[PDB]
Write an enzyme that holds these catalytic residues in place. Structure first.
Site, PDB file in Angstrom:
ATOM      1  N   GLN B  15       0.823  -1.204   0.000  1.00 52.57           N
ATOM      2  CA  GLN B  15       0.000   0.000   0.000  1.00 52.57           C
ATOM      3  C   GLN B  15       0.860   1.257   0.000  1.00 52.57           C
ATOM      4  OE1 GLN B  15      -4.147  -1.595   2.027  1.00 52.57           O
ATOM      5  NE2 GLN B  15      -2.773  -0.337   3.279  1.00 52.57           N
ATOM      6  N   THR B 145       4.252 -11.339   7.022  1.00 51.03           N
ATOM      7  CA  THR B 145       4.953 -11.332   5.743  1.00 51.03           C
ATOM      8  C   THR B 145       6.033 -10.257   5.714  1.00 51.03           C
ATOM      9  OG1 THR B 145       3.038 -12.212   4.550  1.00 51.03           O
ATOM     10  CG2 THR B 145       4.696 -11.023   3.265  1.00 51.03           C
ATOM     11  N   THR B 179      -2.080  -4.178  14.542  1.00 51.40           N
ATOM     12  CA  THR B 179      -3.102  -5.206  14.391  1.00 51.40           C
ATOM     13  C   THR B 179      -2.724  -6.524  15.056  1.00 51.40           C
ATOM     14  OG1 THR B 179      -2.176  -5.730  12.213  1.00 51.40           O
ATOM     15  CG2 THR B 179      -4.051  -4.213  12.290  1.00 51.40           C
ATOM     16  N   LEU B 252      22.732   4.341  -5.065  1.00 54.47           N
ATOM     17  CA  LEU B 252      22.482   3.720  -3.766  1.00 54.47           C
ATOM     18  C   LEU B 252      23.745   3.646  -2.918  1.00 54.47           C
ATOM     19  CD1 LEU B 252      20.067   0.812  -4.763  1.00 54.47           C
ATOM     20  CD2 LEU B 252      19.517   3.109  -3.926  1.00 54.47           C
ATOM     21  N   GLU B 254      25.981   5.799  -2.576  1.00 58.35           N
ATOM     22  CA  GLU B 254      26.237   7.079  -1.926  1.00 58.35           C
ATOM     23  C   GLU B 254      25.436   7.247  -0.640  1.00 58.35           C
ATOM     24  OE1 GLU B 254      26.231  10.188  -4.750  1.00 58.35           O
ATOM     25  OE2 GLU B 254      26.764  11.775  -3.326  1.00 58.35           O
TER      26      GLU B 254
END
Ligand SMILES: Nc1nc2c(ncn2[C@@H]2O[C@H](COP(=O)(O)OP(=O)(O)OP(=O)(O)O)[C@@H](O)[C@H]2O)c(=O)[nH]1
Ligand SMILES: Nc1ncnc2c1ncn2[C@@H]1O[C@H](COP(=O)(O)OP(=O)(O)CP(=O)(O)O)[C@@H](O)[C@H]1O
Ligand SMILES: Nc1nc2c(ncn2[C@@H]2O[C@H](COP(=O)(O)OP(=O)(O)O)[C@@H](O)[C@H]2O)c(=O)[nH]1
Ligand SMILES: [Ca+2]
Ligand SMILES: [Ca+2]
Ligand SMILES: [Ca+2]
Ligand SMILES: [Mg+2]
Ligand SMILES: [Mg+2]
Ligand SMILES: [Mg+2]
EC number: 3.6.5.-
Lengths: 425, 438, 338, 54
Positions: B15, B145, B179, B252, B254
Site C-alpha cells: 500500500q 509477511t 493489528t 544507492l 552514496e
C-alpha cells in the site's frame, strides 16, 4: 476466499446454530430462499466466508447439521430459514444419545461420525482456501458434547493445519436438564483443551441471570437464552464476515488472543442489553461492554486478570471517541490487564450495526477469571464422582472409572494453569 | 545510468509502494496509462527517471517494481487501481493464506514455498537492467509477511546479488494502528536476520506519522491512506536524487557513504517539513530558515526521539522548491547558535545539502497542501536507539513468560532464535550508547 | 482519576508528594512497572526517558529533566561554566575551579597556582568530587586524587556571630514543564557549630558546613540553632542588627541572578516544550557568602532533601505548581522571570 | 562555514557545509535452515497423528 465450515451438533447446537444463520443471513441481505436482497456491497464482499454460491446466484450456508435424534433437526428444516440449508448437509441418526457423553463419543456417535466427515470433506474440497471450522454445541448433553468432541478429534486428524473454533454452552444447575451434565461437561472440556484453538464459553447460568435480572424476563425460556447467543455469535464473527484490519480471520484471531496453547477459552460479552429506542452513547457502550453483568460466562472479571481482549464496535460512530473511551477503560483499570503483554486490548469498528440497533459492542476477553467456570463444574463433578453416583450410565457403554479420574485431574490442571498466570508479575 | 528495483512486501509495503508510484508518475508527468508526453525518446533512453521506469516500444513507462504478499486482497487493489495499466501481471505476486502476523510462518513455512517464485520474478526485472544498482525494500516490522518473508528475501538477495546495495523503508509498529500483540517479536526477529543484509534502512514509526496527521493535517482518526500519502512524500524526497538530475545521493552506494560510517548503525532519522493542511485556503509560506529549523523539532521526525541527548554521525538536507544555497547556509548558522547539535569527535560537523528546484508534488485532492519549498533531513543520530529500547522492552516483558512463543515453535522455528535475536538487539543498543554517550 | 508510579523509594521529598497525591482522592498509585501512568516519580539513575510519551491517550509527566546532570555534577558544572559563552570564563559568581583526572587541566591549575604563590595572595585550594582535602600546597592535592575538581577555597567567609562560625545557604528551586523558574521563599543556612580556624585546615569540623559532619564530628552541634539550621527570618534579622542590611538586598539578589544564569543556560538542551513528554524537577542550590557580602555558587543538587520544618509547605507547592498545573484537580514561590 | 564541492544543474544544485573539522550465509546454508524448520514441523505433526491414533 478464506472459507469457514460451520458445524452444529445436538439439540442445543442446532437450535443455536439455526438462530445464528437466521441472524447473519439477515445482516448479509440473504432471504430464507438464498436470494440476496441487500442495498450495500459490504454485505457481499466477504459473504463467501460463510456462504456458498450456487446456480441462479443463490447463497447456500456452508453449514453441516448433525444429531443422533431427528427431532430437533426436523424443527430446523421447518424453521424460518430451514429451506436455505443444503439438504445433503443434514446428517442424523435415530437412537439419540440420552444426555450421555459415552453414547455420543464411543457408541452411538461412532456409528454416525464417518458420514459427517464425508459431508465435511465435500465442503472442504470446494473451498478455495479453507480457514478452519466453527462448531456450535453444548457440553451438558450427549450428542453435541460426546459426538461433538469426537468430530473435532477426527476433523483435526484429517485437517491438522486448520483452525478449530467452537461456541460451547456450559451447563448450569439453574438451567439443567439432567444431573449428569457435570460429567458430560468435564469430559468435553479436556477434549476442547487439546483439540480447539478458540472456544467461546457460553454459560447458561449467565444467560439466565441476564434474562431474569437485566432483561426483566421472569420466566426465561431456551428461546430467550438463544436470543443472547445469536447476538453474541453475530458480534464475535463480525470481523470475519465484513472488511476490516483486526482479527480478520480465525488464525490471526488466535495469534492475538491465545498467549498459551491451553488457555484459549474466552468470555464473550454484548451491549446493549435493553429490557429500547434510546440512543446509546459510545461511553455507555464501552462501560456496559466491560461490565460483568454483560458477560456470558458468569465469571467476575475483577476476580482475575485479562490476558488479551478483543472489542468490536458496530454502527456509525466516532472512531476517535471509540479510541478515547477504550483507552479510558484500560488506563482507569490497568490493574486488571497483565503487564507482561503490552497493548493486549485490540479494537475494531464495523459500520453495519446489527438488526434493531443503531450501534452495539461485542466483548471477547481471555481472562484468568474463567477458572471460576471450570472450578464450578469441577465441584459439581466431584460431588457425584466421590460416590460414583450415576456412573453406571457410562460404564454400561464401555467406559472405565479411570477415564473419569483423568478428566477430573485434567480440568484441575487447567484451573491451576490459569491461577499461575493470575499471580504472575 | 543504473537501474533500481523496488520490492514491496506485505500489506504495508504494497500500500505504501502503491502511494509512492502514484507520486512518481505525478512528479515525472507519467499518466495512469504509462504514457509520458515529455519523454521524446520513445521506447528507450538512459535518463535519470529511467532508473525507476523502463520503456516499452509503445511508449509505456513501467515501474521497476515487484509486489509480494501472501494474501491476494491487497495486491488485487493494485490490479484494479488507477495505475493498473502501469504494471503487468508478472510484477504482482500473491498467495492463498497470509503469515497470520507470525514471523516464523512468513519466514519458514510460507516463505520456503514462494521464495523461488519471487526471485524468478525479480530476475526478470534484473535482466532488463544494463547496470543494476540494487534494491529498495518496503515492508512492515510487525506483519508476518513484512517481517518474516522480507528477512528471507534479503538473505537470498545477498546471495544472488552480492555486489548490489539494498535499502529498506521499514514501518515501526505503533499500537494506535497496530493489528497484532506479537509485533515486537516480529520486529526484533526480522531486524536480527536482516541486519547484516541491509546497507541503509529508513524506519518510519506509525506513531509519528499518526500524530503528524492529527496535529498538522487536522485528521481526527488518520487512516492508512492518510499515513501512506505522507510517507510517500518522505520516500519521494529520499529517492528524488536517484530519479532526477543532481550530484548528491545519485546512486544507492552514496547513501551508505554519506549516512552510514559504521555498518550496523545504518538507521538514519528522517525529519520532514513543512506539513500543511490543504483544508485552509491560505497559509503563510515558510522560509528556508523556518523549515530548516523545523528539521530539529522532534514533532516532525519520522521516529519520536530526542537528538539533543545523542550524537550525530552524518546529516543530509534534501530541499525541494524555491531554495538557494545562500539561504541554507544563513539558516544553518542561526540554528547552530540555538540548537544542541553534537557530532562524534571522529566525524566532521557539517551538512551535505541537496536542492531540487521542482517544488514538492501533492496528490490532487489529498490532505497535504502545495508549498513553495520543503526539506527532508536525513541525520544518523544515536538518539534513534530509543526506538530500539522501547521495542526491546516490550519483547522482554512477553518473552519472560514465553507468551505466544508456541505459535513460532509450531511453525518450525526454534525457541533459541528468540534469545539469539534479542542478544543481537542488546549488542545494537550497546553500540549506540558507546558512540553517542560519555 | 490521575495515575502515577513511584520508582525512588529513598526520596523523602516525593514520598511526601506521593502521600499528598493519594490524600487528594483524585490520584491513584500504580505498580512501579505499569506504563499507563500520568506521572512518574522516577529513579535517580538511568531513568528511561526513551520510553516516556509513547502511551496513546496519556499525558505523561516526569519529575526529572533529562540532561540536567550537566548542572548537577562537580566536573560537569565546571566544564559548563568555562565553555558556555552565556556564563563565560569571566564568570564572577563561581569560584576558580579546574577538573583534574587521576580533557584534563593539571598543567593549567598549577599555572594559576604559581601566580598566586609569587604574589603572596592566599593560595589555599579544595579538592572534591561526586572525601575532601583542604591544603595550601598543590603537591598534596594532586597526590590525594591518586575524577576530581580543585577550586579556590574561600578563605574569607562571612562568619556568624556569636560563634565566629561558617555556613552555607541552600536554596530550593522548582522548574515546571513550561520552564518557569520558581524559587522557594524559604531557605536554610547550614551553619558550622565550631569557630572558623584558618590556621589548620585538617580539622574540617569548622570548614565543612555539612549537616552530617556537624552532627558527627562537631562538639557544639545544635548549640546556637536547632540542628545547625538557621532559617531566613532569623538570618535576616541578624543581617539587620549586625550589618545594617537585609537578606534580600545583600544576598538574595545575587542568588536569584545565579539561579537564572544556570537554568537559562541549559534551557535549550533540556527543555521539553515541544517534546512528547513533559518534565519538571526540584533543584538544590548551595551558595557561599564571603565577608564582602558576595555570593558564590558551590554546587547544584539534582535530588535534594528538604528541611524537616519545610517538607509540608514545599512538597505541597510541588503538587500545586508542577503537577496540578498539568493535571488539574476538581504563593510560596518567587517566580524568576526570563 | 566552508562551502565545498558546489555542483549546479538546470534542476538544482548541491554542496557541503563544514562547520568544524573532526576531533554472508551461502545458498546451501540457507536451504538447510529452511529444511531444518520444515523437518521440525513434520516431526511435530507426526507426534500429533501418533497421539490421535492412540
Ligand atoms: N503506515 C502504514 N502501516 C501499515 C499499513 N498496513 C499495515 N501497516 C502496519 O503494518 C503492521 C502489520 O503488518 P502488515 O503489513 O499489515 O502484515 P503483512 O506484511 O501483510 O503480513 P501478514 O501477517 O501475512 O498479513 C501493523 O503495525 C500496521 O500498523 C499501511 O498501509 N501503512
Ligand atoms: N570553594 C569552597 N570554598 C569554601 N568552602 C567550601 C568550598 N567548597 C565547599 N566548601 C564547604 O564544603 C561543604 C561541602 O561541599 P560540597 O557541597 O561540594 O559537598 P557535598 O555535595 O557533599 C554537600 P551538598 O550535596 O549538600 O552540597 C560546603 O557546605 C562548604 O561549606
Ligand atoms: N442456551 C441453550 N442451551 C441449551 C438449549 N438446549 C439445551 N441446552 C443446554 O444443553 C444441555 C443439554 O444438551 P443437549 O443439546 O440437549 O444434548 P444433545 O442433544 O445430546 O447434544 C443442558 O445443559 C441444557 O441447559 C438451547 O436451545 N439453548
Ligand atoms: Ca446401532
Ligand atoms: Ca525515453
Ligand atoms: Ca552484503
Ligand atoms: Mg436435550
Ligand atoms: Mg497481510
Ligand atoms: Mg552533592
Amino acid at each position: 476466499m478464506r472459507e469457514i465450515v460451520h458445524i452444529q451438533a445436538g439439540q442445543c447446537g442446532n437450535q443455536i446454530g439455526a438462530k445464528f444463520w437466521e441472524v447473519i443471513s439477515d445482516e448479509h441481505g440473504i432471504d430464507p430462499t438464498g436470494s440476496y436482497h441487500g442495498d450495500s456491497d459490504l454485505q457481499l464482499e466477504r459473504i463467501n466466508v460463510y456462504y456458498n454460491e450456487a446456480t441462479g446466484n443463490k447463497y447456500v450456508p456452508r453449514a453441516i447439521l448433525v444429531d443422533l435424534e431427528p427431532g430437533t433437526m426436523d424443527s430446523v428444516r421447518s424453521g424460518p430459514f430451514g429451506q436455505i440449508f443444503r439438504p445433503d448437509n443434514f446428517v442424523f441418526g435415530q437412537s439419540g444419545a440420552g444426555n450421555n457423553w459415552a453414547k455420543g463419543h464411543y457408541t452411538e456417535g461412532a456409528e454416525l461420525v464417518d458420514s459427517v466427515l464425508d459431508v465435511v470433506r465435500k465442503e472442504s474440497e470446494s473451498c478455495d482456501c479453507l480457514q478452519g471450522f466453527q462448531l456450535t454445541h453444548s457440553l451438558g448433553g450427549g450428542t453435541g458434547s460426546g459426538m461433538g468432541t469426537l468430530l473435532i478429534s477426527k476433523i483435526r486428524e484429517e485437517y491438522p493445519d486448520r483452525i478449530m473454533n467452537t461456541f460451547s454452552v456450559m451447563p448450569s444447575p439453574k438451567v439443567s436438564d439432567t444431573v449428569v451434565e457435570p460429567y458430560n461437561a468435564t469430559l468435553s472440556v479436556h477434549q476442547l483443551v487439546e483439540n480447539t484453538d478458540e472456544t467461546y464459553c457460553i454459560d447458561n447460568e449467565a444467560l439466565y441471570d441476564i434474562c431474569f435480572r437485566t432483561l426483566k424476563l421472569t420466566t426465561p425460556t431456551y428461546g430467550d437464552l438463544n436470543h443472547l447467543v445469536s447476538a453474541t455469535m453475530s458480534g464475535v464473527t463480525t470481523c470475519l464476515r465484513f472488511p476490516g484490519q483486526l482479527n480478520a480471520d480465525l488464525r490471526k484471531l488466535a495469534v492475538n488472543m491465545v498467549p498459551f496453547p491451553r488457555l484459549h477459552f474466552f468470555m464473550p460479552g454484548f451491549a446493549p442489553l435493553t429490557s429500547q429506542y434510546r440512543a446509546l452513547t459510545v461511553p455507555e457502550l464501552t462501560q456496559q461492554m466491560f461490565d460483568s453483568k454483560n458477560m456470558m460466562a458468569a465469571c467476575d472479571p475483577r476476580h482475575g486478570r485479562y490476558l488479551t481482549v478483543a472489542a468490536i464496535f458496530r454502527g456509525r460512530m466516532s472512531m476517535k471517541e471509540v479510541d478515547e473511551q477504550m483507552l479510558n477503560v484500560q488506563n482507569k483499570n490497568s490493574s486488571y490487564f497483565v503487564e507482561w503483554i503490552p497493548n493486549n486490548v485490540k479494537t475494531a469498528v464495523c459500520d453495519i450495526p446489527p438488526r434493531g440497533l443503531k450501534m452495539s459492542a461485542t466483548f471477547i476477553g481471555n481472562s484468568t477469571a474463567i477458572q471460576e467456570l471450570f472450578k464450578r463444574i469441577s465441584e459439581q463433578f466431584t460431588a457425584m464422582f466421590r460416590r460414583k453416583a450415576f456412573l453406571h450410565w457410562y460404564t454400561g457403554e464401555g467406559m472405565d472409572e479411570m477415564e473419569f479420574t483423568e478428566a477430573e485431574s485434567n480440568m484441575n490442571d487447567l484451573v491451576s494453569e490459569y491461577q499461575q498466570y493470575q499471580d504472575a508479575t | 545510468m543504473r537501474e533500481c528495483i523496488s520490492i514491496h512486501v506485505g500489506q504495508a509495503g504494497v500500500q505504501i509502494g502503491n502511494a509512492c508510484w502514484e507520486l512518481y508518475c505525478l512528479e515525472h508527468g507519467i499518466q495512469p496509462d504509462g504514457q509520458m508526453p515529455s519523454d521524446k525518446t520513445i521506447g528507450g533512453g538512459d535518463d535519470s527517471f529511467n532508473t525507476f521506469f523502463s520503456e516499452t516500444g509503445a511508449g509505456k513507462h513501467v515501474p521497476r517494481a515487484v509486489f509480494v504478499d501472501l494474501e491476494p486482497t491487497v495486491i488485487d487493489e493494485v490490479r484494479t487501481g488507477t495505475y493498473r495499466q502501469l504494471f503487468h501481471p508478472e510484477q504482482l505476486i500473491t498467495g492463498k493464506e497470509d503469515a497470520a502476523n507470525n514471523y516464523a510462518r512468513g519466514h519458514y513455512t510460507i516463505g520456503k514455498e514462494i521464495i523461488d517464485l519471487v526471485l524468478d520474478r525479480i530476475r526478470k526485472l534484473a535482466d532488463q537492467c544494463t547496470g543494476l544498482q540494487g534494491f529498495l525494500v518496503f515492508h512492515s516490522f510487525g506483519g508476518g509477511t513484512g517481517s518474516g518473508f522480507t528477512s528471507l528475501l534479503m538473505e537470498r538477495l545477498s546471495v544472488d546479488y552480492g555486489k548490489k546495495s539494498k535499502l529498506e523503508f521499514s514501518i515501526y509498529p505503533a499500537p494506535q494502528v497496530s493489528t497484532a500483540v506479537v509485533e515486537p517479536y516480529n520486529s526484533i526477529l526480522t531486524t536480527h536476520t536482516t541486519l547484516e543484509h541491509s546497507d541503509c534502512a529508513f524506519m518510519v514509526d506509525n506513531e509519528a506519522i499518526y500524530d503528524i496527521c492529527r496535529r498538522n493535517l487536522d485528521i481526527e482518526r488518520p487512516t492508512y491512506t492518510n499515513l501512506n500519502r505522507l510517507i510517500s512524500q518522505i520516500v519521494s524526497s529520499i529517492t528524488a536524487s536517484l530519479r532526477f538530475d543532481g550530484a548528491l545521493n545519485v546512486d544507492l552506494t552514496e547513501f551508505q557513504t554519506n549516512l552510514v560510517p559504521y555498518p550496523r548503525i545504518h538507521f538514519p532519522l528522517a525529519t520532514y517539513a513543512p506539513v500543511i493542511s490543504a483544508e485552509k485556503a491560505y497559509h503563510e509560506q515558510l522560509s528556508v530558515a523556518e523549515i530548516t529549523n523545523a528539521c530539529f523539532e522532534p514533532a516532525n521526525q519520522m521516529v519520536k526521539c530526542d537528538p539533543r541527548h545523542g550524537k550525530y554521525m552524518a546529516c543530509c538536507l534534501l530541499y525541494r522548491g524555491d531554495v538557494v544555497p545562500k539561504d541554507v547556509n544563513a539558516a544553518i548558522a542561526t540554528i547552530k547558535t540555538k540548537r544542541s547539535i553534537q557530532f562524534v569527535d571522529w566525524c566532521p560537523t557539517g551538512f551535505k545539502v541537496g536542492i531540487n528546484y521542482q517544488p514538492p508534488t501533492v496528490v490532487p485532492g489529498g490532505d497535504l497542501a502545495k508549498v513553495q519549498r520543503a526539506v527532508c533531513m536525513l541525520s544518523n543520530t544515536t538518539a534513534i536507539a530509543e526506538a530500539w529500547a522501547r521495542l526491546d522492552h516490550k519483547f522482554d516483558l512477553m518473552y519472560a513468560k514465553r507468551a505466544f512463543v508456541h505459535w513460532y515453535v509450531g511453525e518450525g522455528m526454534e525457541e533459541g532464535e528468540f534469545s539469539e535475536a534479542r542478544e543481537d538487539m542488546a549488542a545494537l543498543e550497546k553500540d549506540y550508547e558507546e558512540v553517542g554517550v560519555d | 482519576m490521575y495515575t502515577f508510579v513511584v520508582r525512588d523509594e529513598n526520596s523523602s521529598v516525593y514520598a511526601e508528594v506521593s502521600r499528598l497525591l493519594l490524600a487528594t482522592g483524585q490520584w491513584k498509585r500504580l505498580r512501579k512497572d505499569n506504563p499507563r501512568f500520568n506521572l512518574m516519580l522516577g529513579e535517580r539513575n538511568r531513568l528511561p526517558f526513551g520510553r516516556l510519551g509513547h502511551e496513546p491517550g496519556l499525558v505523561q509527566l516526569v519529575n526529572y529533566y533529562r540532561g540536567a546532570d550537566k548542572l548537577c555534577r562537580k566536573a560537569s558544572l565546571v566544564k559548563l561554566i568555562k565553555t558556555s559563552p552565556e556564563l563565560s570564563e569571566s564568570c564572577t559568581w563561581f569560584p576558580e575551579s579546574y577538573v583534574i583526572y587521576p580533557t584534563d587541566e593539571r598543567e593549567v591549575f598549577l599555572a594559576a597556582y604559581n601566580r598566586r604563590r609569587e604574589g603572596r595572595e592566599g593560595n589555599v585550594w579544595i579538592a572534591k568530587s561526586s572525601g575532601i582535602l583542604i591544603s595550601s600546597e598543590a603537591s598534596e592535592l594532586l597526590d590525594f586524587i591518586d575524577v576530581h575538581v580543585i577550586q579556590k577555597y574561600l578563605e574569607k567567609p562571612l562568619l556568624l556571630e556569636p560563634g565566629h562560625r561558617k555556613f552555607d545557604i541552600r536554596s530550593w528551586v522548582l522548574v515546571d514543564h513550561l520552564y518557569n523558574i520558581y524559587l522557594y521563599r524559604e531557605g536554610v543556612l547550614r551553619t558550622s557549630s565550631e569557630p572558623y580556624n584558618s590556621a589548620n585546615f585538617q580539622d574540617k569540623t569548622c570548614h565543612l558546613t555539612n549537616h552530617c559532619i556537624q552532627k558527627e564530628y562537631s562538639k557544639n552541634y545544635g548549640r546556637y540553632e536547632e540542628g545547625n539550621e538557621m532559617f531566613f527570618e532569623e538570618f535576616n534579622q541578624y543581617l539587620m542588627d549586625a550589618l545594617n542590611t537585609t537578606l534580600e538586598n545583600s544576598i538574595l539578589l545575587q542568588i536569584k541572578h545565579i539561579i537564572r544564569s544556570c537554568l537559562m543556560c541549559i534551557e535549550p538542551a533540556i527543555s521539553t516544550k515541544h517534546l512528547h513528554y513533559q518534565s519538571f524537577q526540584l533543584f538544590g542550590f548551595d551558595f557561599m557568602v564571603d565577608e564582602e557580602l558576595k555570593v558564590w555558587l558551590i554546587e547544584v543538587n539534582g535530588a535534594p532533601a528538604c528541611a524537616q520544618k519545610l517538607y509540608a509547605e514545599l512538597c505541597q507547592g510541588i503538587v500545586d505548581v508542577a503537577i496540578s498545573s498539568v493535571f488539574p484537580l476538581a504563593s510560596i514561590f518567587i517566580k524568576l522571570h526570563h | 562555514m566552508e562551502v565545498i564541492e558546489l555542483n549546479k544543474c538546470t534542476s538544482g544544485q548541491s554542496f557541503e557545509v563544514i562547520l568544524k573539522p573532526p576531533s554472508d550465509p551461502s545458498l546451501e546454508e540457507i536451504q538447510k535452515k529452511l529444511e531444518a524448520a520444515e523437518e521440525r514441523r513434520k516431526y511435530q505433526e507426526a507426534e500429533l497423528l501418533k497421539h490421535l491414533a492412540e
